[PDB]
């Protein structure tokens, strides 16, 4: 019996949702998304790992007034892209960068309705910024920067303290796509994992610190 879904507060017009699995080794984990606000226009910032989570999370902005436009997920794995195919079946508009949604369906999943390429892409103009720093935790990891308040969604790219599952990783590119995303968002006030708590700018300086460690080790025998 996995922990409730939870949603707080971070800043003005966004929220922090945590969803829970159970992770062999390592006991429940949470994993963190965003919820953004746009007027009267809530986006999801990857969706809990579960449909009926995903629609707890719908049902708690909608009951407030908000009218869900969008999901994007930072990355194929189930912790982003788990609530995909509840939010198709309800036709809220689904989006992944072309490769996530690659990704999706060579692991054998429910791809996202809308797709997009390139480094930059903006979900919301002036509001909700996807940015592909490299390959890392995954190929295909992006991370979604909110202008206004600065504040980062690093997904799961951002691993301060230890790089996680290696599983999918590009270890080989992950120091310089660390690199790339630290020399970018040096301004972020908030900067948000998926698997720890909330931070500052210096999440970039561990993370890339963990990155070049984790290519060390891959070297050894
Ligand atoms: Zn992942
Ligand atoms: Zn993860």
Same mark, same amino acid.
């Given at each position: 019996?996995?922990?409730?879904?939870?949603?707080?507060?971070?800043?003005?017009?966004?929220?922090?949702?945590?969803?829970?699995?159970?992770?062999?080794?390592?006991?429940?984990?949470?994993?963190?998304?965003?919820?953004?606000?746009?007027?009267?226009?809530?986006?999801?910032?990857?969706?809990?790992?579960?449909?009926?989570?995903?629609?707890? &999370?719908?049902?708690?902005?909608?009951?407030?007034?908000?009218?869900?436009?969008?999901?994007?997920?930072?990355?194929?794995?189930?912790?982003?892209?788990?609530?995909?195919?509840?939010?198709?079946?309800?036709?809220?508009?689904?989006?992944?960068?072309? &490769?996530?949604?690659?990704? &999706?369906?060579?692991?054998?999943?429910?791809?996202?309705?809308?797709?997009?390429?390139?480094?930059?892409?903006?979900?919301?103009?002036?509001?909700?910024?996807?940015?592909?720093?490299?390959?890392?935790?995954?190929?295909?990891?992006?991370?979604?920067?909110?202008?206004?308040?600065?504040?980062?969604?690093?997904?799961?790219?951002?691993?301060?303290?230890?790089?996680?599952?290696?599983?999918?990783?590009?270890?080989?590119?992950?120091?310089?796509?660390?690199?790339?995303?630290?020399?970018?968002?040096?301004?972020?006030?908030?900067?948000?994992?998926?698997?720890?708590?909330?931070?500052?700018?210096? &999440?970039?300086?561990?993370?890339?610190?963990?990155?070049?460690?984790?290519?060390?080790?891959?070297?050894?025998?």
């Amino acid at each position: 019996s996995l922990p409730d879904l939870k949603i707080e507060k971070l800043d003005e017009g966004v929220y922090v949702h945590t969803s829970f699995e159970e992770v062999n080794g390592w006991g429940v984990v949470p994993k963190h998304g965003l919820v953004v606000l746009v007027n009267a226009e809530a986006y999801l910032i990857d969706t809990p790992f579960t449909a009926k989570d995903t629609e707890k &999370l719908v049902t708690w902005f909608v009951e407030r007034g908000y009218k869900i436009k969008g999901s994007i997920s930072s990355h194929f794995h189930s912790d982003s892209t788990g609530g995909i195919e509840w939010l198709n079946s309800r036709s809220i508009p689904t989006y992944a960068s072309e &490769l996530t949604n690659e990704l &999706l369906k060579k692991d054998g999943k429910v791809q996202a309705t809308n797709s997009f390429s390139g480094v930059n892409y903006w979900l919301v103009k002036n509001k909700i910024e996807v940015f592909y720093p490299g390959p890392g935790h995954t190929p295909d990891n992006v991370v979604v920067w909110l202008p206004e308040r600065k504040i980062l969604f690093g997904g799961c790219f951002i691993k301060p303290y230890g790089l996680g599952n290696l599983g999918d990783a590009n270890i080989e590119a992950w120091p310089k796509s660390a690199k790339l995303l630290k020399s970018k968002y040096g301004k972020a006030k908030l900067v948000v994992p998926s698997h720890s708590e909330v931070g500052d700018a210096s &999440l970039l300086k561990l993370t890339l610190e963990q990155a070049v460690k984790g290519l060390n080790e891959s070297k050894k025998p």
